[PDB]
Amino acid sequence: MPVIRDFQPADIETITAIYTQAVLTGTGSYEIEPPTMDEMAKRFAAFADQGFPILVAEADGRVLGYAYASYFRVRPAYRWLAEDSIYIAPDAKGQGIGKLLLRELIARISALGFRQLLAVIGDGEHNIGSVKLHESLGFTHCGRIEGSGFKHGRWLDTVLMQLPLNGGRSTEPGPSPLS
Amino acid sequence: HHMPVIRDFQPADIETITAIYTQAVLTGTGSYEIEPPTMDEMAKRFAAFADQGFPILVAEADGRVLGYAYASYFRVRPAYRWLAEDSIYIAPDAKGQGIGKLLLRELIARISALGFRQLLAVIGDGEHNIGSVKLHESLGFTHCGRIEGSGFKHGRWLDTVLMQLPLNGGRSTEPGPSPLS
Numbered sequence A: 001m002p003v004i005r006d007f008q009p010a011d012i013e014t015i016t017a018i019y020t021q022a023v024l025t026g027t028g029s030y031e032i033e034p035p036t037m038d039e040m041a042k043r044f045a046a047f048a049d050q051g052f053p054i055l056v057a058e059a060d061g062r063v064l065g066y067a068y069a070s071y072f073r074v075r076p077a078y079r080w081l082a083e084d085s086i087y088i089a090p091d092a093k094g095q096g097i098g099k100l101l102l103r104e105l106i107a108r109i110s111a112l113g114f115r116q117l118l119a120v121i122g123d124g125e126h127n128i129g130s131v132k133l134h135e136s137l138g139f140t141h142c143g144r145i146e147g148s149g150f151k152h153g154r155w156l157d158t159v160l161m162q163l164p165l166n167g168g169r170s171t172e173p174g175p176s177p178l179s
Numbered sequence B: 001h002h003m004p005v006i007r008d009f010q011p012a013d014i015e016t017i018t019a020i021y022t023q024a025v026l027t028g029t030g031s032y033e034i035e036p037p038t039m040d041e042m043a044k045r046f047a048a049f050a051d052q053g054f055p056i057l058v059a060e061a062d063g064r065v066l067g068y069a070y071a072s073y074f075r076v077r078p079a080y081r082w083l084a085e086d087s088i089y090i091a092p093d094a095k096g097q098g099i100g101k102l103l104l105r106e107l108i109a110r111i112s113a114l115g116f117r118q119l120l121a122v123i124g125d126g127e128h129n130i131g132s133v134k135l136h137e138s139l140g141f142t143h144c145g146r147i148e149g150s151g152f153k154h155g156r157w158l159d160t161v162l163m164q165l166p167l168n169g170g171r172s173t174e175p176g177p178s179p180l181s
């Protein structure tokens, strides 16, 4: 059975391999050239420095996928809004590993006191698995930026979905998370 | 009132632009900043937009800058290279006079000329900032989403309203080379 745990620096090689394959063959990522392992490490060190959780799914000593949270935008009024990203190795897809990862990410983001979790889903018309995954964990549709991306010779839509946490906007906020 | 003219931003405009933005940050929820940036930070932001190649425009009458508008990236990853975002701020005593429309119309023309295919408006506190929504509707932007409770400012939860305008055919044809390449 797979376990969800925190990202550890030794994972960065596999995670680069997982993300590299997503960049090259998929449209969930709007990057075109795969980042280097060092660049991936710098990106993850910035997230952790901000205080955001970075999680990996591991079975039989191998990293099956990863998910992390970050800011949608950084201006201070946005400080109760987080964004999720999740990538699963192709040989591990369709096994329930995405939902396990995202379920735990929601719990961590919720405990940090965020009020909204945003999915910015690249090529949402085509990446049905991403939309279904988020619907299955209670995200609701909140917008669609048409023709926001062009990659592999076609236009891509960005599907936006959000999940309220800790009462959402119906209650007064607490202190800023990560403050 | 003398007709405002639209021209490219000049570095010496930054003092007035900072004054305009400061008043908006302090008294309004269109911006999700809380503490107003300094004039030197504003200068650095505008230099960076201009370095990327984005147009920055001001409306000027009787020697005074009455408002400004600029474009920038929504997000910087390469597949987004045909998507731009607009920002526009008008001085309080110049609002409701068509200056926002004059500036945004010319920004659309300049951004279209660069080969972008979509122009995105990310409107803070859309429930309250009707002027922002109406300005963008009046120039053909269509609603494309609403992030509820995206901001908290001035004691209130705020919704972000998203609107977009296709340019040069939008997503109906293959794009040209990346703008600003």
Ligand SMILES: CC(=O)SCCNC(=O)CCNC(=O)[C@H](O)C(C)(C)COP(=O)(O)OP(=O)(O)OC[C@H]1O[C@@H](n2cnc3c(N)ncnc32)[C@H](O)[C@@H]1OP(=O)(O)O
Pocket (backbone or CB within 6 Å): A022, A026, A027, A028, A029, A084, A085, A086, A087, A088, A089, A092, A093, A094, A095, A096, A097, A098, A099, A100, A119, A120, A121, A122, A127, A128, A129, A130, A131, A132, A133, A134, A136
């Ligand atoms: C905001 C974001 O990060 S969006 C994701 C961006 N990342 C990518 O696009 C990278 C490539 N894709 C992936 O990494 C993965 O396939 C993901 C993230 C889309 C899903 O991860 P998975 O491990 O495959 O998901 P998991 O097995 O937990 O099931 C996901 C849910 O969506 C459904 N689903 C998963 N894959 C598919 C698919 N290809 N087609 C249709 N439905 C699918 C499942 O049925 C399940 O919901 P259910 O309760 O109705 O059964």
Ligand SMILES: CC(=O)SCCNC(=O)CCNC(=O)[C@H](O)C(C)(C)COP(=O)(O)OP(=O)(O)OC[C@H]1O[C@@H](n2cnc3c(N)ncnc32)[C@H](O)[C@@H]1OP(=O)(O)O
Pocket (backbone or CB within 6 Å): B024, B028, B029, B030, B031, B086, B087, B088, B089, B090, B091, B094, B095, B096, B097, B098, B099, B100, B101, B102, B121, B122, B123, B124, B129, B130, B131, B132, B134, B135, B136, B138
């Ligand atoms: C993505 C963005 O940048 S959103 C804007 C962010 N900026 C701010 O919030 C700062 C504070 N507000 C402002 O700077 C300005 O008021 C703006 C930019 C929202 C609008 O600019 P203005 O010059 O006031 O608008 P302008 O007079 O040009 O009117 C544009 C259109 O919107 C309409 N409109 C403007 N304000 C309102 C209002 N409060 N209620 C109803 N309609 C309005 C006008 O009737 C006009 O439409 P029409 O030509 O069909 O008659």
Ligand SMILES: [Cl-]
Pocket (backbone or CB within 6 Å): B010, B011, B012, B013
């Ligand atoms: Cl000058």
